[PDB]
């Protein structure tokens, strides 16, 4: 098992801001052994960032993904094209897109199937908001959200899983490194699978990054704002190398 | 007024069968002086086609589009990365994404207000369903539709119309043409506008694209699956320059 | 002249056991039973067999002011319909706006129950109505059509059916005509009941009768009270 | 011995006034009245005053299927539980499983309607149940925790809540003891019943009954023949 550490740049990035970035980054980056390291840009910028994942050891991945191969989904984005920019992993089921755009449980287990058969690796995305952990229900939650996006696949092991706590409000830490163990081991219970990677998307930054690594169920980070920023995100990387 | 006749490519075409589709048709299309070209691929595959198209006559557009600039929206694209990559159109509010990815006439809304401020020239779809037609409610349905998306919009003659009238069953000709120029009438009436184009969206082939363009309220097309062979497509420009 | 006018009460979720009692004893006895008038009382539904026993042997037509459209099945909390024709039920509120709001009609459902209370000779009254938002846009027309549409596929005998026209809002007379013929002529017949929903006081309901679109009133607040109920009849009398 | 168990039945949308008078006479006139028993029968809304006037100076309970969290007011087709309380209404089921598909209740609803009835000393019976594809996936507690917070949210005597398991299927006895035991453990307290709304009949009232976490029924199509009801109640009787 490497750890994986994930950068969700979101809707962010020009095409200058994106090679500017690369720049900074992959002249700086150690290729530790131990971590697979994933960049995931803005969907039109994939080619782009094809060009510059492509000789390097970063991971292309892709924010989002529709389930077919192709057809009427005006705006979507095929599996096929992923596959032949080289993307190797994919962020499915992403809070923003459950909120925002219609991502149901229901979609979210057709993307992670569709995934699995042309082979990239999805990145299944759960989480609860502050009512729910507030309600003591979080655990209930996630399990709800991994049993459905789950059902009828044979091999969870080809999964990877982010812990993404919902929060409304920012607190630069939207749960205690204990808090997100004991949440880490529930879903490795669920997930039946020790291969599986369970990575905290969270709030991560370089000041908590090694109390978080620490605990032994947290496999790495699915990191958003702080990834955008590349110094701050090789210092997260140099942390987790120890 | 110049026609528009766009091609919505919608999840279709890897990057082998992009790059042959602008062999054949970059090789073979007139640049008619009376058509603006737009052709909308795939939203990861914008960057190979802003390559085809900047030196061509043919316009960029795109699928759809976010309504900010940049921030948390986990798979958005981003208005100011179509502006980079030279689209000039942008498909707003296709039924495809109101029937399946959270597509609301709110957002719709702000999605023009972006494509304005932006100088996208957004291209707003809209259209009613079997049942719609059948209870005798098209024209109601759209100006509803039209209303709603347009509210708070001073100046509606730098907005496109595709009415695409929305139909589980295919039929070859979701309307008569007859039909289309009354739509398009009533439409031009909501719009308040000579300038913008409405184009029809509807089933438009190379076996009626002449009656339909003939109709004067019928200022182009928004063709979907016919615009995916090249052939097809320069046949349908080819009866649109009489 | 074809025409009676229909002044319904909408009680909605007021008046105890005891105040329906003062009220049915003070309202019939002194109500004049006016023949160009159907007058339509609507209790709460918990309140529908004290009512009809009060206006047995009355000019009063008791309403109901939701139901369901099946006849008896596994529908925990809802009215049947032959309940209420057992009890003399006349007419029934369906798709009030705060039932499309809070409590989950659908156009779908509505349709079904305006079917269901035409099988069973009660006479529905379908409330439709635009919210502001609506109205600002200028789409108050379209919305009407469709919310009657939905409502009525596949219905016959739209003569039938009453409609009861309140612009949805928080809590003119020419505009309300305007509207109300623009409603007729969705129904397309005349003989269908057209009544204003909306502010109906002493001050404005003849103006308001006098309307040829506006075929009555669905009366709220202003009816719980027996002596307003009833100086708003006298002057739709004239 | 700290419990008495509560047997109730829900009549659903079923049964005339006429049914409900030849049921109730049968009834009150022939059921022991166990000690160990809350009995509650819940008829329609409508019918709702014929039910009290039978059970006044009985020890039925009675129960109504569903109401209103407001006392007062602009809610078309709703029931006040002020009226209830004037009619007598001890019992309400809330969000009945029916209610939820259909007619829009959600837990935010529910959460409101529960305050109000303990607000007025009208003890309610929460319904919490999952379906067939929340079982088969296994997430059943898991389904029925997140009903249970969520319609229990900032009301602090959960101990004046009773609660009624119903699994959602179209229309085991351990199993059933293993759900009851894990929502008692989510109540925090021993006083709220829970009582189980599957199917009960008398060749199983008694092993049901058994169980230390199944404190009665609400007892749903089975209940409507005043017969079998009290066989069921005789066989919990030992």
């Not at 840009?41 to 000789?55: F, I, N, Q, R, Y």
């Not at 958003?224 to 090789?234: N, T």
Request: proline letters at 3%; aromatic letters at 8%; hydrophobic letters at 35%.
């Amino acid at each position: 098992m490497k750890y994986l550490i994930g950068a969700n740049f979101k809707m962010y990035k020009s095409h200058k801001d994106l090679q500017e970035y690369f720049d900074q980054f992959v002249n700086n980056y150690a290729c530790f052994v131990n971590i697979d390291l994933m960049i995931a840009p803005m969907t039109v910028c994939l080619g782009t960032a094809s060009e510059m994942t492509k000789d390097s050891c970063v991971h292309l991945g892709a924010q989002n993904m529709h389930y077919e191969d192709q057809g009427a989904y005006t705006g979507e984005t095929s599996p096929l094209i992923l596959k032949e920019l080289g993307a190797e992993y994919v962020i499915i089921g992403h809070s923003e897109r459950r909120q925002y755009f219609g991502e149901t449980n229901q979609m979210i287990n057709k993307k992670l199937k569709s995934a699995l058969q042309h082979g990239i690796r999805p990145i299944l995305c759960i989480g609860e908001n502050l009512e729910q952990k507030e309600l003591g229900i979080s655990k209930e939650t996630l399990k709800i959200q991994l049993r459905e996006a789950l059902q009828g696949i044979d091999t969870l092991d080809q999964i990877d899983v982010a812990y993404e706590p919902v929060r409304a409000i920012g607190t630069g830490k939207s749960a205690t490194p204990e808090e997100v163990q004991d949440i880490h081991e529930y879903i490795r219970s669920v997930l039946g699978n020790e291969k599986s990677r369970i990575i905290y998307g969270g709030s991560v930054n370089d000041t908590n990054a090694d109390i978080l690594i620490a605990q032994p169920a947290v496999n790495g980070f699915l990191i958003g704002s702080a990834s955008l920023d590349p110094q701050k995100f090789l210092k997260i990387l140099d942390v987790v190398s120890k």
